[PDB]
Amino acid sequence: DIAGLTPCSESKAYAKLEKKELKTLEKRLKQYEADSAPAVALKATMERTKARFANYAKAGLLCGNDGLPHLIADPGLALKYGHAGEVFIPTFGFLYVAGYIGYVGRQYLIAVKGEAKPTDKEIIIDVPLATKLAWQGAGWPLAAVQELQRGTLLEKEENITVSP
Amino acid sequence: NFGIGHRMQAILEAHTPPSGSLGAGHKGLFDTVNNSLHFQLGLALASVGTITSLVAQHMYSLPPYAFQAIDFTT
Amino acid sequence: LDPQIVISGSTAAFLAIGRFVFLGYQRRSTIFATNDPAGFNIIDVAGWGALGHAVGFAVLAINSLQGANL
Amino acid sequence: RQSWLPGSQIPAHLDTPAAQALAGNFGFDPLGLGKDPVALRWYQQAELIHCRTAMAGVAGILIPGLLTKAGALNVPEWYDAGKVAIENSFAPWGSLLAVQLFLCGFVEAKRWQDIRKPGSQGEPGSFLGFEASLKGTSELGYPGGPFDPLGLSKEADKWADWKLKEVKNGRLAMLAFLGFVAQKYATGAGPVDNLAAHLKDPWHVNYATNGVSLP
Amino acid sequence: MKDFTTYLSTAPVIATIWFTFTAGLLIEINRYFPDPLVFSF
Amino acid sequence: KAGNWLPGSDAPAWLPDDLPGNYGFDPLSLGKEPASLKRFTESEVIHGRWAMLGVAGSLAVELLGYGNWYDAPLWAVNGGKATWFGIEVPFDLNALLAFEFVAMAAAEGQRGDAGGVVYPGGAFDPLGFAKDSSKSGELKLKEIKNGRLAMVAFLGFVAQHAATGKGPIAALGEHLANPWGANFATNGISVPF
Amino acid sequence: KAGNWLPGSDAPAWLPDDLPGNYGFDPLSLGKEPASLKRFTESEVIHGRWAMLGVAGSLAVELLGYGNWYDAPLWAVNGGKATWFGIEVPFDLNALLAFEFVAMAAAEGQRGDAGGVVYPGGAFDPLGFAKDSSKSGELKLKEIKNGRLAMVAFLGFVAQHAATGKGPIAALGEHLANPWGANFATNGISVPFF
Numbered sequence: 001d002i003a004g005l006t007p008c009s010e011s012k013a014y015a016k017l018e019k020k021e022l023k024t025l026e027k028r029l030k031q032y033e034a035d036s037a038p039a040v041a042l043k044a045t046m047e048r049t050k051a052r053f054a055n056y057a058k059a060g061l062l063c064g065n066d067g068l069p070h071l072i073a074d075p076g077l078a079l080k081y082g083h084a085g086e087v088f089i090p091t092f093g094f095l096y097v098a099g100y101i102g103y104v105g106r107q108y109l110i111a112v113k114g115e116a117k118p119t120d121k122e123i124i125i126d127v128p129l130a131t132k133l134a135w136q137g138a139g140w141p142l143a144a145v146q147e148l149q150r151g152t153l154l155e156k157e158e159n160i161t162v163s164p
Numbered sequence: 165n166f167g168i169g170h171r172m173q174a175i176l177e178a179h180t181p182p183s184g185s186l187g188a189g190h191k192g193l194f195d196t197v198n199n200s201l202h203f204q205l206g207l208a209l210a211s212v213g214t215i216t217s218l219v220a221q222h223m224y225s226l227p228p229y230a231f232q233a234i235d236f237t238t
Numbered sequence: 239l240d241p242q243i244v245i246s247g248s249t250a251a252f253l254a255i256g257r258f259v260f261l262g263y264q265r266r267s268t269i270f271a272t273n274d275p276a277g278f279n280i281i282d283v284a285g286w287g288a289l290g291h292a293v294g295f296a297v298l299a300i301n302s303l304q305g306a307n308l
Numbered sequence: 309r310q311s312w313l314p315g316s317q318i319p320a321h322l323d324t325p326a327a328q329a330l331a332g333n334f335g336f337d338p339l340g341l342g343k344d345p346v347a348l349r350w351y352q353q354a355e356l357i358h359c360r361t362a363m364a365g366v367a368g369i370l371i372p373g374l375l376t377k378a379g380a381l382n383v384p385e386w387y388d389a390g391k392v393a394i395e396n397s398f399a400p401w402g403s404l405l406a407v408q409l410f411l412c413g414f415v416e417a418k419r420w421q422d423i424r425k426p427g428s429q430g431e432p433g434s435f436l437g438f439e440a441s442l443k444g445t446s447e448l449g450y451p452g453g454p455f456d457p458l459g460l461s462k463e464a465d466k467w468a469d470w471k472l473k474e475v476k477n478g479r480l481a482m483l484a485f486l487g488f489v490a491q492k493y494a495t496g497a498g499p500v501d502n503l504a505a506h507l508k509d510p511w512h513v514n515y516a517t518n519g520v521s522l523p
Numbered sequence: 524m525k526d527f528t529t530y531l532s533t534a535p536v537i538a539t540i541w542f543t544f545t546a547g548l549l550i551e552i553n554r555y556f557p558d559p560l561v562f563s564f
Numbered sequence: 565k566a567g568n569w570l571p572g573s574d575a576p577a578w579l580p581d582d583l584p585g586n587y588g589f590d591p592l593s594l595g596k597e598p599a600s601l602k603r604f605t606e607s608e609v610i611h612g613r614w615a616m617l618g619v620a621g622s623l624a625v626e627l628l629g630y631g632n633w634y635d636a637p638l639w640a641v642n643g644g645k646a647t648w649f650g651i652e653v654p655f656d657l658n659a660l661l662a663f664e665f666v667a668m669a670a671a672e673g674q675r676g677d678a679g680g681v682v683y684p685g686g687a688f689d690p691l692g693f694a695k696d697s698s699k700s701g702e703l704k705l706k707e708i709k710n711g712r713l714a715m716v717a718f719l720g721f722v723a724q725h726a727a728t729g730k731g732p733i734a735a736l737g738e739h740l741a742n743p744w745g746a747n748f749a750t751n752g753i754s755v756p757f
Numbered sequence: 758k759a760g761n762w763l764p765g766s767d768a769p770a771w772l773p774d775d776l777p778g779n780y781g782f783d784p785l786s787l788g789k790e791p792a793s794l795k796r797f798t799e800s801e802v803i804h805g806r807w808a809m810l811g812v813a814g815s816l817a818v819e820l821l822g823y824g825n826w827y828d829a830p831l832w833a834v835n836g837g838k839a840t841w842f843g844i845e846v847p848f849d850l851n852a853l854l855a856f857e858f859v860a861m862a863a864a865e866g867q868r869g870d871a872g873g874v875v876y877p878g879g880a881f882d883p884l885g886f887a888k889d890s891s892k893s894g895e896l897k898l899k900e901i902k903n904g905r906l907a908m909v910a911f912l913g914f915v916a917q918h919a920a921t922g923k924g925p926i927a928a929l930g931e932h933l934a935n936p937w938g939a940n941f942a943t944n945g946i947s948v949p950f951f
């Protein structure tokens with residue numbers, strides 16, 4: 001109960017919709033023998049389903065008027081009420097991987113311009129070079145903020161313009 | 165015409181922030197607003213176009229006429 | 239709160255603040271006639287007289303919505 | 309010289325004379341994080357102070373832990389010793405951490421400026437006569453003066469030994485604390501309790517018999 | 524076969540190997556971790 | 565100069581060492597233009613002088629027992645009959661507000677838009693201490709230092725009242741009644757966690 | 758000089774042998790700059806003089822039987838009616854604290870920020886002993902030595918009261934009543950193990 005909401009372990013339309021889905025799976029399950037793999041598959045679907053509802057209520061996800069897990073994307077309402085795993089943890093779990101791919105792709109382009117013809121090595125990726133920058137870019141925020149302090153991250157007004 | 169009031173040619177040009185925040189400030193805009201019509205038309209369509217939405221955003225929520233927000237197609 | 243004192247004294251106040259205090263800070267087909275010593279013609283008086291009346295009508299109105307809650 | 313892998317090419321930013329003049333230089337940088345020289349100099353200051361806080365920390369975990377399992381103390385486990393000693397105390401933890409960050413923050417922000425400019429706090433008129441002894445040494449991370457009461461610094465030989473002994477006991481203690489956290493999540497017992505469990509049965513009681521080296 | 528490894532190191536071939544890597548990694552994780560809507564522990 | 569505010573830091577070149585209250589404290593480079601700095605040296609003193617008068621009036625009410633600084637304008641609402649030294653003054657809000665608008669702008673317009681001076685030589689020095697010969701920059705330094713303390717302390721009154729709702733001496737007695745339980749962390753405002 | 762404090766040790770070059778109370782005892786090199794040392798020679802004497810006045814007031818209370826030094830500010834809390842020689846003084850805490858803030862800063866500001874001298878020649882020598890001719894550095898040495906003893910002894914009062922909770926003479930009588938069972942080891946504070 002943060003913004004008119006309720007815990008999904010406490011709401012009833014959530015549990016009503018769980019019983020709605022398991023009803024649809026079981027009336028689909030009835031057409032098969034109890035040994036048959038079209039019934040082994042559906043009972044494995046249920047145990048993935050029933051554990052999914054158990055795990056969403058375990059994490060304390062917020063339901064509402066429709067009985068669905070609602071997310072809270074604000075720190076200070078997720079840090080305070082124990083919901084940083086909804087948005088506030090994957091907003092840095094993403095931005096680690098995002099700037100990682102950016103930094104590896106940056107370092108591959110920076111370390112290819114001092115060559116004979118760098119356009120050839122954007123077709124033919126230097127795999128012993130590219131994987132070497134791939135592994136060693138794992139501390140990229142530790143390397144970027146040191147490059148941020150110099151002035152070597154931002155190229156100056158050598159950049160190309162039209163008519164300022 | 166009466167000696168009191170503000171001149172537009174001294175409010176734009178004199179609002180230049182120090183330490184080069186906004187270049188030379190608003191210096192010299194007045195002869196490029198007064199002489200240019202497309203600048204005057206572009207400001208007017210920017211202002212009227214936002215206070216046309218402001219008409220629309222404030223008449224479904226705050227219906228100003230009687231038995232509106234009961235006539236639904238209106 | 240009084241009908242005739244407050245609106246008279248407020249205009250008397252604001253025809254003195256531009257007359258004795260804000261004289262030089264305001265100064266930074268011939269109707270401007272400086273016959274008071276630093277140009278206090280009817281154009282300047284009706285500017286400080288519009289401020290003198292309007293704040294005086296604001297005081298008498300705030301004194302009469304049953305009272306103050308400030 | 310004495311690399312962490314004897315067959316590896318040591319990266320070239322650990323073989324410069326401003327990097328081979330450094331304690332704990334075993335050629336170990338498989339991410340290249342200290343290729344920039346001031347970034348090496350900044351991370352060298354991060355390693356000295358992550359390790360000295362860990363050596364003080366680990367000696368605040370096992371030394372009152374070994375001297376509890378042997379009797380003559382009643383200090384509880386380190387993951388529960390924050391819960392106790394606040395009732396044998398006077399402030400809330402909020403009222404105690406804020407005075408902590410004031411006291412620690414005055415120190416750390418002076419070490420910050422001495423890293424930025426060595427001999428910052430040795431300028432006259434900073435302190436009340438005490439600022440004279442705060443120029444550090446010719447190399448940073450090793451202040452001396454009032455931080456060396458016993459006077460071990462003034463040798464110039466046996467000195468790289470005390471450097472490299474500090475770092476190696478320091479790096480071992482950082483792995484010890486990364487130990488202590490991990491051997492509290494995985495089994496919930498004490499670190500000396502995990503040492504007692506491994507000594508009474510080495511060949512069955514380890515991290516191969518819990519759910520964290522899971523296949 | 525050095526020329527054959529250049530072909531394996533072109534742009535679309537590394538793209539179709541790395542995308543089978545990255546999808547095939549996320550497919551195996553989403554098998555052994557069924558339906559991660561929220562970061563649990 | 566006489567100070568460095570963070571020892572080891574370089575000094576900003578646009579702060580002259582002759583100026584009273586100087587430490588080289590401008591991390592924003594907020595006074596790099598000389599006209600902006602000249603307006604700021606005027607405005608720091610006047611903020612400092614009015615706060616020294618402000619923080620003394622906030623203390624001397626509680627030192628003399630007349631409620632606190634927050635409750636002294638609680639007669640214009642929820643009653644009337646304003647006091648000063650216990651003595652009644654029969655003014656409502658809407659009259660003295662007009663009195664302090666005309667008379668204060670009459671003193672502002674003589675001060676502000678009649679120059680830019682902040683240490684006026686003459687009638688504002690009755691006894692005579694700073695004749696601008698030698699003892700000027702020393703006493704100007706003390707007017708800044710006691711003034712900067714007052715501006716902090718008034719900001720330490722508003723934030724203290726926004727947090728706890730108690731006055732200066734009314735909670736200084738509480739910090740002395742409980743040194744570890746009556747500080748800025750026991751309320752769930754200044755430290756949220 | 759007149760002493761070595763650890764025989765066989767070299768002397769620090771930044772401690773002049775002319776100075777009263779010198780032994781060459783600065784293992785931290787804590788006074789290597791001359792302005793820092795000059796402030797310290799001012800501050801050691803004043804710490805020494807106030808502690809000699811401090812340790813005498815802590816003893817003469819128990820020598821005259823008025824509780825101890827720790828319990829003399831136990832009237833501002835838990836009661837009132839402060840005593841001195843048994844005589845009442847009708848001052849509460851909040852008045853004399855304001856008296857000793859104004860009057861003491863009035864004596865500090867005449868002392869501290871009006872120079873840097875620590876042996877003022879003139880009105881602070883009523884009878885006249887050190888006229889700075891020959892007997893000066895001898896008696897300045899004794900003012901240091903009795904002063905350094907007092908600063909140790911006051912630190913030996915706070916740590917003794919933090920450990921045992923008893924006063925100076927109240928436990929000196931106990932060390933004389935039990936020489937081997939009333940020392941700093943029988944309490945489980947100064948030695949934690951045995």
Ligand SMILES: CC(/C=C/C=C(C)/C=C/[C@@]12O[C@]1(C)C[C@@H](O)CC2(C)C)=C\C=C\C=C(C)\C=C\C=C(C)\C=C\[C@@]12O[C@]1(C)C[C@@H](O)CC2(C)C
Nearest residue numbers: 337338339340358361362365368369386389390482485486
């Ligand atoms: C600071 C620290 C711990 C300090 C702990 C303290 C003070 C504990 C205090 C307490 O317990 C007590 C005393 C008492 C308890 O009641 C209370 C608490 C408060 C709980 C550990 C550091 C721990 C630091 C650790 C573990 C760092 C490990 C880093 C490694 C291994 C990185 C290696 C690399 O980065 C390099 C070197 C180079 C790259 O190229 C390659 C890779 C491999 C990436």
Ligand SMILES: CC(/C=C/C=C(C)/C=C/[C@@]12O[C@]1(C)C[C@@H](O)CC2(C)C)=C\C=C\C=C(C)\C=C\C=C(C)\C=C\[C@@]12O[C@]1(C)C[C@@H](O)CC2(C)C
Nearest residue numbers: 589590591592594611614615618621622633636715718719
């Ligand atoms: C805090 C303050 C200004 C703070 C500004 C600071 C620190 C700025 C610092 C910096 O800019 C520099 C230096 C350099 C930049 O590069 C960086 C920053 C960091 C940005 C001004 C307060 C200024 C505060 C003032 C002037 C307060 C005046 C209060 C008065 C007159 C009170 C009157 C009353 O209290 C009585 C007397 C009786 C009550 O009953 C009734 C009332 C009316 C409430």
Ligand SMILES: CC(/C=C/C=C(C)/C=C/[C@@]12O[C@]1(C)C[C@@H](O)CC2(C)C)=C\C=C\C=C(C)\C=C\C=C(C)\C=C\[C@@]12O[C@]1(C)C[C@@H](O)CC2(C)C
Nearest residue numbers: 782783784785787804807808811814815826829908911912
């Ligand atoms: C111990 C002390 C200082 C000790 C410092 C030492 C040893 C430093 C040694 C070093 O620096 C050197 C030399 C050289 C460096 O290289 C190495 C080290 C080792 C760092 C000062 C105490 C100084 C102690 C002082 C000044 C005590 C003053 C006490 C007073 C006035 C008491 C008053 C009362 O007791 C009465 C009178 C009546 C009671 O009822 C009420 C009260 C109020 C409690």
Ligand SMILES: CC1=C(/C=C/C(C)=C/C=C/C(C)=C/C=C/C=C(C)/C=C/C=C(C)/C=C/C2=C(C)CCCC2(C)C)C(C)(C)CCC1
Nearest residue numbers: 200201202203204205206207208209210211212213214215
């Ligand atoms: C191209 C160009 C142009 C054009 C431009 C345009 C088109 C613009 C537009 C613009 C716009 C379109 C803008 C907008 C703006 C807006 C704003 C800026 C807003 C603000 C808001 C506010 C301020 C609010 C406030 C508030 C709130 C918060 C709520 C309640 C009330 C209040 C009031 C309080 C021209 C012509 C010039 C020419 C040149 C170039």
Ligand SMILES: CC1=C(/C=C/C(C)=C/C=C/C(C)=C/C=C/C=C(C)/C=C/C=C(C)/C=C/C2=C(C)CCCC2(C)C)C(C)(C)CCC1
Nearest residue numbers: 249250253283284285286287288289290291292293295296
């Ligand atoms: C003769 C003379 C004199 C006198 C003078 C005077 C006294 C003047 C005055 C004047 C005046 C006395 C003026 C006035 C003015 C005013 C005005 C000009 C007004 C305006 C108004 C308005 C604008 C209003 C509006 C409104 C209304 C309608 C109502 C309600 C509110 C409002 C606001 C809406 C003397 C003796 C000194 C000297 C000699 C000469």
Ligand SMILES: CCCCCCCCCCCCO[C@H]1O[C@H](CO)[C@@H](O[C@H]2O[C@H](CO)[C@@H](O)[C@H](O)[C@H]2O)[C@H](O)[C@H]1O
Nearest residue numbers: 390391392393394395396399400401402405408409757
């Ligand atoms: C270095 C910076 C990082 C430091 C991180 C510090 C994290 C530890 C903060 C305190 C632990 C979590 O806090 C949580 O347990 C504390 C210990 O019981 C509680 O604190 C309180 O708990 C009990 C009452 O309920 C009392 O017995 C405790 O004396 C009291 O301190 C807090 O009400 C609770 O919010």
